[PDB]
Each structure stands twice: as C-alpha cells, then as structure tokens.
C-alpha cells in the first residue's frame, strides 16, 4: 500500500475496551461482523421517521450527553497526547453517562470514537501516534442511550497551525452552519449540498462525495441520505419531526478519497488536508434545532 501522505497507522492498538453489561447495547454490538439487523431491514426504504414527543426527548438527551463527551475530548487536544488516550477518555465518559459508544463494533470498528488527523477525511482509528504541533484533528462522537443515537464532531487545532489550516477549518464550519441555516419544513434534502459546495468552491476547496449526512434516531444511520455536494439526487423533503446529520468534509485539493488497508480510515487520494464538522438536527415548524449545540459557550472549540 502506497500511503497518500505523511500519516501512518501506529500499532499495536490497545486491546478492545469492554462496556459493562448494565449499559444498554445497540443490536450490532453483539453481531460478529458488527452488522445492524435493524439498519439492514430498512435498507432500500427512503421514508423518514416523524419522531414522537417521546423520541424527541430521547434524542435531546443523548445529543446533550454526546456534546458533553466531545467537550471532554476537546480539553485533551495538544501536542504529545495520543489518539488512543483520547478514545480511552471518551469510552469512560460514555460509560459514566450510562451510554454505549456507538462506533464500538459498528461494522467491527475497533474503537469508541473516530480520530481523524490531517489527510484523514473521516473514520480514523485511535492509535499510538502522539499529536504533533500544526496537526488538525477531528474527534467524532456518537452515543447510544435508552435506544437513541446522538452524533457530532469538531475539528481542533494542535498547538499553532498554519494559515491554510485556519482557512480550511473556518470554511468547513461555515459550510455546516450555512446548510443548517437553510433547514426548515419543505426544503429538499438535496439542496444542502448546493449550499455547501458553493461556499467550499468560493474558498478554493473541494467536497467529499463518498460520505454523507444521515438520518439518526433508533438507528445510527438511516434515511435520509444527505450528500454534501452540488446537484446530488438525494430523495426527500424536510418535515417537522425529522432528525438527521449534516457532516461536510472539505478538502484542500481534490475531493477523491481512498481507504487504508485497515478497511476504515478514509484519506485524501492527493495527501492534502481535510476538515469536518457535524451536528444532529431536529426539523421544527420555524427551522431547526441543533440538538448537539454547546449550552455554555457561543463558539466551537477551534475559535478559542
Ligand atoms: C465497513 O465500512 C465502514 C468504514 C468505516 C467506518 C465504518 C463504520 N463506522 C464507525 C463509526 C462510524 C461513525 C460514523 C459517523 O456517522 N459519524 O458521523 C459512520 N460510520 C462509522 C464502516
Ligand atoms: Co459522527
Ligand atoms: Co454522522
Ligand atoms: Mg510515528
Ligand atoms: Na482531516
């Protein structure tokens, strides 16, 4: 395998971390290949759940707890900290909140969060590599509580970064917030990628095509499929009571991705950097609510 950039996997991985049996588990947690029978059944259906008041309470809760976990991770980002150390802290934080860390054994993913450095687009595997000054790193959190999944991510700066890194991360966060600003009943899911690509292109960046936003609730990934690029052919119209993610991945060079031999880590084919942000959204009569919002701070972590 020809690595596309400087980054390499740093093995061995610490042994798999267990989740106490007192924590409720999603179906895939105990499937040998990590398959979700509940997802595979609804595969091919493009209808979107209208959440009950009860489902909404369940999503507010898990999304609040997932934000608390991301904030734990954010406090650890500096040179010399390994991504495995971040994951271990995340895993304990989930357990402390009576939550299962959704990524763990999702299609056999080996860790409890995804940590994506520099040319990693998404799904990076926490490992023994110490973070270096100048790195950008995304931590992607998803929790499972009382039957509901809540999903968010942010990109962080590792010490001082270059102007390029600042512009990439800022634009990506802007792409996400412009998409969010367009969400309200009667907007087509396919329109969000028009707004995202328009802002990325204006700043000289490209938009990943291979990975999309998703419906989330009782399933980790379900309808709708939410592409981040322009002139996609997503099916569906937003209605009050729909929950889904927007999670744009923006690249310094081309949009093309490829996967490492580990089967998970997605990287730019050109080796240039990629950044990502994600929120879980509830569509309301007036617009949308950001379920994974910060409660105690106006801005994302990179802004400080
Ligand atoms: C075999 O196919 C693959 C390849 C890579 C990853 C995985 C599975 N998986 C693990 C966790 C995980 C997190 C997200 C997420 O939505 N963040 O917003 C998505 N997929 C995920 C499967
Ligand atoms: Co996520
Ligand atoms: Co997601
Ligand atoms: Mg090394
Ligand atoms: Na990256």
From Swiss-Prot:
It is found in: Cytoplasm. Its EC number is 3.4.11.18. GO terms for molecular function: aminopeptidase activity; initiator methionyl aminopeptidase activity; metalloaminopeptidase activity; metalloexopeptidase activity; zinc ion binding. GO terms for biological process: platelet aggregation; protein maturation; proteolysis; regulation of translation. Zn(2+) 3 binds at residues 140, 151, 278. Cotranslationally removes the N-terminal methionine from nascent proteins. The N-terminal methionine is often cleaved when the second residue in the primary sequence is small and uncharged (Met-Ala-, Cys, Gly, Pro, Ser, Thr, or Val). Required for normal progression through the cell cycle. Belongs to the peptidase M24A family. Methionine aminopeptidase type 1 subfamily. This is Methionine aminopeptidase 1. It comes from Homo sapiens (Human). The lineage of its organism: Eukaryota, Metazoa, Chordata, Craniata, Vertebrata. The chain holds residues 81 to 384 of 386 of the full protein.
